[PDB]
């Protein structure tokens, strides 16, 4: 086509979606990880995760307001990944890298799994 | 913070949200423009437009599944702007620039209004 493109549009959209999340505006699901609860937008979860994409395209699960993750999933690992989904920023540290990689493998977030493998290989 | 950043994350999120729109997955509103109907995600509309942000933060309007725009709004101008919201690409042409600028002013999409003003000033 003969379209023009606004370079910062995608980043600005994501910044606003994170602002809606922080104010709990139009969140339509709660993700339960052990005792911890995380509110989010189903569409953002699907856009970032192969696991949520599969869950919310399912004719029965698409209508659930509560999703319980596998008890092996660490709440801190999930929180770091949820923050990444809404910001593009990953808080990867020596003390959390194993929990982050395991959570990213479960959530099917290929690019996060790739950077965790590389950072582990270096150490 | 000491975060790392994935450069293509915001663009990849937007690409997936557009894939959900094209398949009509988790769309929660229909925007009526004259006789034409456009399905979309309320959160994406809010993230892109000052007008939709105001509408869907309103305690009564947040629950509406149908929104009727002002009869002066041109359906083609709206379609071009909706495509921009989901892609960052604007199909701006000599034959549509006046309808696009008027629709962007109504929708309160400041960056689109700015490029339309500049393109009109040049001609």
């Amino acid at each position: 086509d003969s379209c023009i493109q606004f370079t910062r549009h995608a980043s600005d959209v994501l910044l606003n979606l994170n602002r809606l999340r922080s104010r709990d505006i139009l969140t339509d699901v709660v993700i339960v990880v052990s005792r911890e609860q995380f509110r989010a937008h189903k569409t953002v979860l699907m856009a970032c995760s192969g696991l949520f994409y599969s869950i919310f395209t399912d004719q029965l699960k698409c209508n659930l307001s509560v999703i319980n993750l596998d008890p092996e999933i660490n709440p801190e690992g999930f929180c770091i990944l949820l923050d990444f989904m809404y910001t593009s920023r990953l808080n990867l540290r020596e003390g959390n890298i194993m929990a982050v990689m395991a959570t990213a493998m479960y959530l099917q977030m290929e690019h996060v799994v790739d950077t965790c493998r590389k950072f582990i290989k270096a150490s | 913070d000491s975060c790392i950043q994935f450069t293509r994350h915001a663009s990849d999120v937007l690409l997936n949200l557009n894939r959900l729109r094209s398949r009509d997955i988790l769309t929660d509103v229909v925007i009526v423009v004259s006789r034409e109907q456009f399905r979309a995600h309320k959160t994406v509309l809010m993230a892109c437009s000052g007008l939709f942000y105001s509408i869907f933060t309103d305690q009564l309007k947040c629950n509406l599944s149908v929104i009727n725009l002002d009869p002066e709004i041109n359906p083609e101008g709206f379609c071009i702007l909706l495509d921009f919201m989901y892609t960052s690409r604007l199909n701006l042409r000599e034959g549509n620039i006046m309808a696009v600028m008027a629709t962007a002013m109504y929708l309160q999409m400041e960056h689109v209004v700015d490029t339309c003003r500049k393109f009109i000033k040049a001609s």
Partner: peptide
């Protein structure tokens, strides 16, 4: 704005 750019030419993509």
């Amino acid at each position: 704005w750019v030419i993509p």
